[PDB]
């Protein structure tokens, strides 16, 4: 309000650590972190991912072991991403709802072993189709909206039955949130949260995910911002408990507008390519390790309530010290 | 959007600790706490304050002893309140700017031993006038505005000279922020912060401070909210680095409006009477100790960047667990 | 608008009582007060509450006597809180809807004796369950949402049948307002108001209520503010005539945001622990009695239309003089 | 939110007096009333005003008699309007600043007898010029702006010297607020309030004031609303402590906009013609007496902090019941 | 934007008629006027109304004659108010929907004679009940909401059948707009407009209407402003084509807020008592005739699209000249 | 609110002329029109402008003849554009401030014959420089800002001296409004209005003006909208009484934003090319004459207070019917 130099010098609050601490507008805590993890079939399996240095795909027995540390660090939740054996992929994506699928078995195992740990399952067909699209194809190769929802609903129900506290539809079909919510309510899964991937973009930043585990007709055009508000509005009306933006850093303006417009629990995914970029630069000595906390603090400043990040264990370790 | 039961059940996020953690909107940290402390003239002395159970007036040697632990707990700053010997009070309030006054001695001692600890001095005449009004009286007993500013300016300079990083005018004279800022700038105290008590009310909640250590013509009417915004706007234009509301909990609506309107560093004082009423109830077994963190979290939720609170040590200890 | 010292001196309107009166932004009146009262079974019963000095639990005959003064003072309404005999508590909470329960008998007695006095009954199961939770438990000890609503509906209907003009659901089940409204409308209770406890927090300030008469899965996290707006929006859509924030003082920022966002009749509960805090401090001589009116004026300034307060009789007496 | 019949029936809160009381948004109190009064030159004289039934011009002795009752009723302030003897009018308006003029004598007399009663003097030349324009005329009959300010400044100082707490420039010269403020500050009248007639319209509702006691080049076009906001902004920047709209009821939309835009102390004048049309209709039996309180409540609802009204005594009497 | 004297002198645009005309923000035209008219049974009947000087009650033959002038003046619409013979009043208000009632006969006669003239009929039971309440009473003397709607629906249909282009429900029952709209749509009266009396206050300004032709449980409390927005929102959702505030001048702040919030066609009624007030003062010589156009211009400035005014013929005459 | 078909049918208000009239949001009146006119040096001369069919350059005697009818039609003001004889142009533009230049002679002649008619002179050098740029060129052919202001100031004073009520700087030099205002104030031309061409674009729509009578370094880029708000803010702060956008129809969005942002008197120029394209199409039989009123109504709807238009006579004639 009519602030002018030299009466106002914004450097004064910057002069000392104590005053920078008092005026600091945002903080990252371990309550903000969600750890995504790639889950293998089998026993005693651990696979390094070349394009995501430091991240490993884990069979369920190994996941249970590593989760001991994650829980001890106070990380609130995991987001599970199964790595489907290629032979179990099909046109109808039926493995998506197999009670003995990787995601379902992993969920039951973690829910028994660590009852307070949040498990967020991935509701999508892309790791179950032979073609790798997020839904079922018609005879022109188009991803059918409503037919795909029918399969996503079965999948979500199977995750709820396995004990997941949160299902996270990452498919970008229109209307899927309401369809899934209706099915959960009808089946008695009253308190299963739905974390909608509301504004999920058709992005180049997904590169490394493929190595861990057309799209422009469902995923959003990177150019568009207003459209993300309409996407989130629909998902909230349809019953989502949380809404998500993906990717993350390249979309912090979207996080900001979404938080400002709806004042709802807003989440963001720091995707594989964001992780890879940062880690490559750190390893090369081009960026200091402090960039990890800075990247995560950005999400908080931009309005996120929680962050899906492959840095979650390291960040949690740094935060505790 | 159009969120409606049962598609929207706001209890889902409440169902488990992990989700409550993920969606929690505010957190209290040690970086938010400012510890006020009453300082005595002598050596190896403490006094218990009857109307503030658990709070002690401390001689400077005892202040340095207790500050070692405050610093270890990570408390960023102290607010010093001298307890002036009655023999040093006067109509002209000259003790306010004595280079060997309690505040100035305490400041030099703390700046030397704990160089990173913030020291916020109190710029006001009420502890230095025989009558205890915050400024100089005319012959009808009205508190003169501009004559009082002249004394306040000298006092503020004396604090800067003693090494205080922040001076906090608590007097509610009109225009004093700008006068003090000009004086600091002209004397080369470029980086001395001014924490304005901007919206300071004429309140019954100050009961116990008089024990620890006319008003309606300068302090604000408890009925008034819009007026607080005009007070803060003036102080920001006059060069304040931070602005404060006092009292605190009884005025959380004012905190909220002030933060929302100006988005400037906004502080709040949980005053003596607020401390006493909480502590009295805790000691009677009427409220759990958890009320302390609840009361301080309220300030964060209401938009405060920092909190002057007699519970700062107790809070810092609890937060360290 | 470009107001600057010394052209603008905000002390001028403060200089005299007459001008402070002319610019005073808010006023407390007896039209703003609701008196909560604890009601005992039996005849000629009066019980002091150690943790709420000055408040008595009253059998219905004694309540009728005391209500003579309350009505003569112009207090518009009472909020009734029965003290259920321990032997009448059960798993199914059936006493909640007993036409011969304390609340129902008290309502009929007051409606006959004082036809213009508002009676606000408490719709909740916590004073009727053996376990003291606000709803019915499942086999995991979780408070079931929709099953509890069924009982709350019967309770609300029983209160309407007893002649209550207002029912006030304090249970924090999702969707209960709409369920209760639907039931009242279907039964012909067209003009029975519903005063929703919309943003009711899981708070330490409830201590003394227990002596007068888990929760984090239904009552709100003190940290959360945006969430309160979503709570109130739902209750207004579901048909509430009034909406309430509880507790009070520690949540004045919430009152302010709720009034600003919805422009609906907004109420606030100055809870047992707030009363106890203030009264303890007054009795100890730490705060002047004037703090009572200041506390209540705060609620008006923050945007409340009415206040549930155990100070209502004393405040009404002070206001009349 | 999405409030819809029959879930929402806005008549429920209307059903009973107690609920209408609880939700009532505004109230009129005595603290809102300013009583205008026409003051004569002589001794033991009153005159009935034909076009304002029930209002009397009062000599100063009679003014002191009536003020005893105004003070007893708790009316905070009077607005004095002298009735200048024709022989004292002139082209230079010099009687405006005569230390023994009616206004100045009346002010001294009231300040001495009733020290707590606010006195608001009228700063304008229209009762002092032979032609009755509010400023000094040039040779073409245009009302000169800055030449008129010089006289207005002298008049305002004379009022301050006589002890008025508030001076109220009613002239609608550009820039006069700042000129008067500067003069007051430079003369040491630090605390004299300036109540600007900010949005004063060229209105037919002034009919009866001329009986009681060119204009379109200074007073505002009744058609214009946005222009009123610019007028008020200038007066606030120039140092006004209060701002006023005149006339009143015919301009309630302007009151509302002005309060909403500036959130400053906002006053309204229910002018002679508004009084006369109400009083005439009441006397003819065409409107009930209750219309008086209704008209004044309108001002409060529209956002006025205070009301200059010829009904102030009658209102205060009714409010005291 | 930083406008300051003397760079900005707001008197410059006021200096000459031409510039005042160029900047004039609002204009009144005959397209804004609706003429209310009281209609008698019988032939060759004309009755002066003592409390509304210049207004006559007219039998239908006389109405047709006078309407010649009104149409020639360009007045767009009449609002018809029948004066029901006392013997035709009843408990069931059945005369309200008599195809041979005054309003119905008058409507058919005017629709035939002047096909382009708008006819707005009055949907309410108060001129048809023996008791004069706007709806049907229950055995406690309360105006039943939904039972009254059933009769209002029959009335509205009868007006549509008679050829009215607009029906204007003035009853203040909850939900009546949607009920009437549903009935009109079901019956094929697709283009019959509904002009809701949305915010109709329980006012003293209605005095003279009674002579031309309890309420607090349906009509609004004069104190309330926010409530008017909720009233209008419901009426727009329920299908109103126009919304109305009544009374007029004493509620211009309400007109302003309603226009600003909803941007819908907004109408205002300058009621009998407003007409009487002004006319009495004009006749007495207390106000100039120019007050008529000023009063009407106020409504435009406040945001009204049209005005129901007993001044419509005189205003139209003045506008044309 | 939630307006939905078929409860809401927006065609109902469209059904009849009377209702379209009642809800019509904007109207054009004669008071909105400013007539631009090209003025020749000689006597008893007119010239037809090839690129503006129907518009004539007029010698001053012929201007006085045509103005009699313009005044009779009620047109409030003319904007004069001299057509400078080539022999009077120069690098220093000195003819701009000649007391016997065309503009000055025309102004004196019109002020004398038609004292109530507004005269708006054109403050710019483009009709006075040999090269036709709006300011003075440096040796590289850049239009110098502040050197050009000095000439513009002299020109503006010459217009004031000739009696113009309004001067309208059309030059788009930075800072010229304030410079001209200061000069007018210092010379005693207190009431001379300054109509700033604030947002004047570098447009192809000026084609025909050059026939009638580099630019991208001063006139605005057609692509830019936010920049127009900054231009207007500066001009208002510098003391403009009115602000203008030019061209007009191609910039109606700018009109709307400017009115909405500043709520100041906002004017628009329908330039030569807009006139020519409309008139050409009307003459070819491609558009009806009704397009003229439609184009001018657009300006009103977009928020203009007044319109400079070559159709002003034709419009005024049509509006008089
Ligand atoms: K902090
Ligand atoms: K979190
Ligand atoms: K007041
Ligand atoms: K109230
Ligand atoms: K105009
Ligand atoms: K109209
Ligand atoms: Mg979507
Ligand atoms: Mg201040
Ligand atoms: Mg709820
Ligand atoms: Mg002004
Ligand atoms: Mg309604
Ligand atoms: Mg410019
Ligand atoms: Zn997918
Ligand atoms: Zn002090
Ligand atoms: Zn409960
Ligand atoms: Zn005057
Ligand atoms: Zn009626
Ligand atoms: Zn030019």
Curated annotation (Swiss-Prot), chains A, B, C, D, E, F:
5-aminolevulinate 1 binds at residues 210, 215. GO terms for biological process: heme biosynthetic process; porphyrin-containing compound biosynthetic process; protoporphyrinogen IX biosynthetic process. It holds the Pfam family ALAD. It catalyses: 2 5-aminolevulinate = porphobilinogen + 2 H2O + H(+). It is an enzyme of class 4 (lyase). It comes from the Bacteria. CDD domains: ALAD_PBGS_aspartate_rich. Stimulated by magnesium ions. Its cofactor is Mg(2+). Mg(2+) binds at residue 231. The keyword Cell membrane does not apply. The keyword Lyase applies. GO terms for molecular function: porphobilinogen synthase activity; zinc ion binding. Disulfide bonds: none annotated. One of its GO terms (cellular component) is cytosol. Pathway: Porphyrin-containing compound metabolism; protoporphyrin-IX biosynthesis; coproporphyrinogen-III from 5-aminolevulinate: step 1/4. Keywords: Heme biosynthesis, Lyase, Magnesium, Metal-binding, Porphyrin biosynthesis. Homooctamer; formed by oligomerization of dimers. Belongs to the ALAD family. This is Delta-aminolevulinic acid dehydratase. The gene is hemB.
